Write a protein that binds this ligand. Structure first.
Ligand SMILES: CC(/C=C(\[O-])c1ccccc1)=C\C(=O)C(=O)O
Ligand SMILES: CC(/C=C(\[O-])c1ccccc1)=C\C(=O)C(=O)O
Ligand SMILES: CC(/C=C(\[O-])c1ccccc1)=C\C(=O)C(=O)O
Ligand SMILES: [Zn+2]
Ligand SMILES: [Zn+2]
Ligand SMILES: [Zn+2]
Ligand SMILES: [Zn+2]
Ligand SMILES: [Zn+2]
Ligand SMILES: [Zn+2]
Lengths: 331, 331, 332, 332, 331, 331
């Protein structure tokens, strides 16, 4: 089968209106919450909206059997104040993902957002993690820039600021899916910030002692590692002047295949090997447009991997399901 | 012949001491200047230093016949204060590069740094440009982040802040060579900041109307365009939702081949085409380490391009000299 | 008839989702816009939402014949970055209001928000004002604190920063309706910031030369003038030292009656007079809860004014329609 | 008798000069102190200053028998640096008040200021409180905005930042008298910031669990509660969603009657009841100007309360003495 | 006779209470002003207060015939906000000095404060200067640090920011008396800040083109030039590496003799010469204490100058009156 | 003999290049270190550079027999970021001074810089102190303004922030040598900042209870105490109003004689006494210019002190060696 490990929830419109409300009253109305029926959630999983077809129908047309759906990361406003609106909105997004996956278990698998408030100690997400574990969540999006390209930065991923999280992720044996959220920059909007932050997080993890101290830490890097597989040479060369090679740590990482050109998919898989690649597409999303040359949808990239003549059937099965089954502890 | 369009001056130690001195007295001793002889300038280009050999010796070994040399960008301190030390140090480095390329015209071709002070209008570099144009300089390093990964950032390259510079570059029909300088981030050291800044600059140039207003502007993006050829799919798909495709703007851009893996070189050349690639290696520097297994130096990448079977000998001539002669107006 | 001069649009949820999206991509998707059909705009004016009944049904129950609807001001994020998102959102809200008033003209009258970006010159709203003027809009919400209780504040209303706007309004003979937006303070939330900012704006206007320089300027202060009618004594006393009395300038101002206690309404009307009071309720909204002692909604305040012994039927007609009809240039 | 619970010290000019000097040398001359004789402290309570007559003469004319005098709060510079100057000045004002009440005991009762330094833990006032408690002081002015309308603000009164103080006050069975100090805003000067901060403090106290955790806490809000009695309806309505009604907590609060209009006094008394109103005038002060329509000083408000038809003589005795005598632990 | 050129007004207490009031209501009460009778001002000139005797009586005991009285500079709060309180308080101090000098013309001469608001253009003092010229004022205190040792600095005295003032001072042929005001620093309180700022202002004036561009500019530096006469050597040595000597400019400056040790007075006079020294004492003030060795008052320094055996009677007359007569255009 | 207690290392050019390199890569290349031979270290002390002659040659000519050398303070960049480059550069300069004084024990005696990072607790220098104590260092340069004339400043020297250091200095019975470093001010260049900071530090030490708590603490103030001996009168008069006279605290202090005018030298020695003066010249440096009239070099000041008639030969022995031997524990 084909399990897509990088998907984002198609939610009822009421969720985003709840965000607007929280930002309007900033808590003076109390927490409240999203009021939507199961019917409305299911219908949201079918609504066309801005995509060529519905979420479910698109996955069906592309042969994707199941998909791990997480929050749409650029809505999560990790730099917004006050902090409690960040926490509340994260919790409600997670609740809605849980409801949708319970209503549509034949396709959708839950992955959780973290209520990362810029500047707060990472411990402040543990409670929500616990709530999500009980609800059956299979992973967590880890944002390396809760400041959302502001004037300040979070510590690098090798800083012990993040160590309490790694510990917990190993106790649960659940993965962190690197994903930045929004960006306050006029130069670098969110979709490009994703790439730069993936590059930075990978670099941090591959030039620190994280994997010495948490050898079972499972990390999936979004969008084929940002820039790293393409730029691996300079970083390996510079890592020679040190006690560990960049590739030494990088061999511990997993990467999803959210890349919309055959050449990039080929380079990713040849660089890290099928043992460390998990099929992903972000369909529906950035890539849900039609290539005017072929008429196909750009995020319908499974056939590119299925036709690579340098991968065995075992390697393609690793990429399409087994790696996801292990990393996300899927039933 | 082989022309390397991305090299950095091996300078006598007195230049860096002059930088330190300027920062120490901050102008209270006057402008002063570097004090070195022609002999010391020539000797610097043969001294081993940390490299496996002298700059010129490594070029001779790798088969490189001429190299365009610019300042070592991470020393240019565009965010340093007061402004006058940034200007003065840029001026002295340019004067020294001029002296070296006049003393050794067989190997070296001069490329200038711009005295970009964070927050200053871009026109404040024009004077220095003129001076360098009178000294035979063939291009300019354009830093998209003169704030050097600080609390603030400059406007995106599509902003009209930069338009006075594009004008002048078209007036001179000379190219800009995109290259960041330092990085103040504890997460992102300068060598990774290079890549991210190239990604951002290319994105700005390909999502704005710069090339509609300056069709003749010549721009060379360093390090194979950061993440862009690898991440082209998502940005092209997103651009489909606008009036001009990312690809039609990117077709106007040139990229150098400072990539230290065969696979990345292949991906670059197959994505942008040999008509838009200029050979470059940054030898000596980040890539001047010996692969302990295969015995060769990582920045010795000309043979990779020579052996690509999908390139004709004319395509290889383009990559190795003709594009450089056209873009940098080489004699 | 009964005209309610202080109402806020009951809009389809797609509008608030559009706000969320604008904040999410900060303009990198383009302006885009609210995509919503006429039938959705109509249905939103009847949906119960968190109120006991729909907007229109409530106005019917309370006997209100027409309401001037403006944006829900605590959503207008005047302090948000980048500036273009606050401009775009204000514009979208204005056009949606225009559409709703065009579709339900027997009930709703359009009042526009201003795309006030904290720190921008006020002239930057004119382009939108002009547009709204050609769409038939009858007034503009004026926010004295576009910084939304931040680390900085805007100039007081007496400062010449605002004088271009005061000029244009007089050019148009259309009123400003003082209304604050959001509040970033952890001490003073938006509903209380409304009152504090009404107090500050009224004080600014009654201690400067705005009305000397703009005699025909029409200004309606929300929520019965905040604290001023209750605290008028101290301000009058301190003004005695000045060249003009506080009351001298205050008499040029209009106030709406959005007060949810009979005593407050009595004080307001007895303080500023029926010639300067315009009926308003903000129904549905903060006051749309049941007073258990009466069983009636707290914002069903028209009967209090109707049953005031100290007002003639002509004064009540001023409060309930004539004043609004003249201040907001309404048709008849 | 008539006890005025809101008065401010008429002090010799040497005190304000001492403030100026403290700001001038910022402590490099040492703490020093106000150097002023008993005769000067007495003379200051009779000097006309900018008022029509002396402090004591005015209180005599108005029929006030005793007044609780506290610091002039707009001078206490809680946002000034370095912290030690605000501490020293508060201490000096407190001791001068103590001396004046010791010299004129038939008229004046001491109420202390707190040396609140913006950003300091509240515990840093305890040492002064203790001292004032041993000097016979009967209450403390509590400033909810020691930042004085700056770029930052203090925690709301419901925050545990204030809980130590609430504890100590209950330990002492002495009241806090809500009063803001200065205002750095160019829109909202100090006299209006008083009202806005009273509104914010009252809202904080009526929407938190302060009175659940400190049931016997005695709090007197200045100037008739700012805007709250006039704007109570909206806050009650919004509180309905909470677990406690706004009025539920508001009933635990006391308010002084420093309002210079008959209508405002009527509203206050009818809203909170005579059991929670303490007569206060701030005479001499902002209200010490002549109402031309009456010839009487605007802060001569006791007759309004005396002539209210809807109050028994016993309710008026509560307002004029019993409530102050019980809240401020006064002798008889 | 003995004319003391550095004195500060002994004002009625009502002035400082007016300062406190302005800072309390910040303008909401309107400008207002100081209400004091002539009798009260005269009495203030006699009040003991904190000094061993009254101002007038102290000048009498020391043989000082007349004294130029200016504001007490550390009260002038040039960094306070809003600006109008700074302007108003300056104007009222000047009005009171004018009244006192008119009431006591047998001794007191008026010198004016400038309403210098940190960050405002210097032109904003011209109006008050004019008001003071009409009232007969003989000079102006010039503060080189209106920021009062804050996080920011004013431009150096050679910056053209100050040029409109110099121009005006030459049109009036009236002097600037360098005097800092207050200091917000915990390290360096006002009395020491005076010294450091005198040093900085002198350095600025002696390493810039001020005296090239305003050759008739009259400047009196307080407290014997801060540190400069004592430290003149290093600055002269460093000025040799430049187009003008430090002493070249320094010869244009005047210095007052507010120094309370014989050795410092000797060094000042021997360094700059009697032609450029104006007698000053700041009595009553910092120096109004008793030397327990001699019983004399430390600011009774006229006899030190009268007994120096290296000065002629003409030099002592230059120091004690003629220089003041010329510089301050005294009747 | 003549011992000069205020000299600064003439270092090989590679040290300043190492500073520039550290600032360029900000630690991403690791600590590294200066790479110079014993021969280059020795040659640096004989190279003319800008001086009229080599460092050692000038010392020989002036009659100086030994000199205590410390870092050139204006290069130590105590306000630079990140902290680790400040620490590393201080450590390398100290190691180089150690190498030079071990190679040339006839002339040079080692004095250490402190790795003071602005805002760091002072205890963060103790480690380095210990290392230097194991290398035979005889004192430490104490910078009162590690913020280098910035928006912020450190606590005054009387604040208990510094008390841990006083303790250690008494534990080692070694002295602090007050000396500022750089200055970010556009009004006050580093050479004037030296003087002002010495004034402030001396004032703090003489108006606080430091010497009541550390009676044995040894402190040497540079440049004759900035302004203090010249401005002593006002501060003594002000201190009379307190519990301890300025003079009784100042009597515990030592001062060096880095003054380039005879008159200032005289004033210093007559104010503080020969029992508290240590000869010092800062030769070569700011004072190494030739008086074009009198032919001699300005920092050749030993003869001035030799010719003072009011000093006995024992007083001159104190100034020229004994005080230095006692304070700096010289062998
Ligand atoms: C600035 C830079 C520096 C080095 O290569 C380098 C220098 C010294 C030691 C080791 C490496 C490279 C580039 O600009 C580039 O990568 O294009
Ligand atoms: C402002 C000033 C203050 C005093 O003189 C003073 C004031 C009150 C008590 C004690 C001293 C001195 C100077 O400006 C100067 O020293 O020139
Ligand atoms: C830092 C310093 C620098 C010079 O002397 C100097 C250096 C290079 C060229 C010219 C002068 C001196 C002192 O520390 C001092 O004055 O004590
Ligand atoms: Zn994603
Ligand atoms: Zn490069
Ligand atoms: Zn409203
Ligand atoms: Zn009061
Ligand atoms: Zn003075
Ligand atoms: Zn030195």
């Amino acid at each position: 089968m084909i399990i897509d490990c990088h998907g984002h929830v198609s939610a009822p419109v009421e969720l985003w209106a709840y965000k607007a409300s929280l930002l309007a009253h900033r808590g003076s109305h109390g927490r409240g919450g999203v009021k939507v029926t199961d019917e409305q959630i299911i219908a949201a999983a079918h609504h066309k909206e801005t995509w060529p077809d519905g979420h479910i129908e698109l996955l069906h047309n592309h042969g994707t059997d199941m998909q791990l759906i997480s929050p749409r990361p650029f809505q999560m406003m990790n730099s917004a104040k006050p902090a409690r609106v960040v926490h509340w909105f994260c919790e409600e997004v997670n609740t809605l993902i849980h409801r949708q996956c319970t209503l549509i278990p034949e396709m959708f698998i839950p992955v959780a957002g973290l209520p990362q408030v810029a500047g707060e100690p990472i411990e402040n997400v543990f409670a929500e993690m616990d709530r999500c574990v009980s609800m059956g969540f299979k992973g967590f999006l880890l944002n390396p820039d809760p400041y959302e390209n502001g004037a300040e930065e979070a510590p690098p991923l090798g800083d012990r600021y993040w160590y309490p999280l790694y510990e917990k992720l190993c106790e649960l044996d659940l993965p962190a899916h690197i994903h930045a959220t929004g960006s306050q920059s006029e130069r670098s909007p969110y979709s490009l910030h994703f790439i730069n932050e993936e590059t930075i997080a990978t670099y941090n993890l591959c030039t620190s002692s994280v994997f010495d101290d948490f050898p079972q830490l499972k990390v999936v890097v979004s969008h084929g590692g940002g820039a790293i597989p393409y730029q691996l040479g300079r970083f390996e060369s510079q890592s020679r002047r040190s006690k560990h090679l960049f590739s030494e740590r990088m061999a511990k990482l997993y990467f999803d295949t959210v890349l919309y050109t055959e050449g990039a998919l080929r380079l990713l898989i040849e660089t890290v090997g099928p043992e460390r690649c998990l099929f992903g597409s972000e369909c529906p999303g950035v890539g849900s447009t039609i290539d005017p040359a072929t008429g196909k949808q750009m995020d319908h990239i499974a056939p590119f991997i299925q036709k690579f003549d340098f991968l065995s059937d075992a390697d393609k099965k690793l990429i399409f399901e087994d790696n996801a089954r292990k990393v996300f502890n899927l039933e």
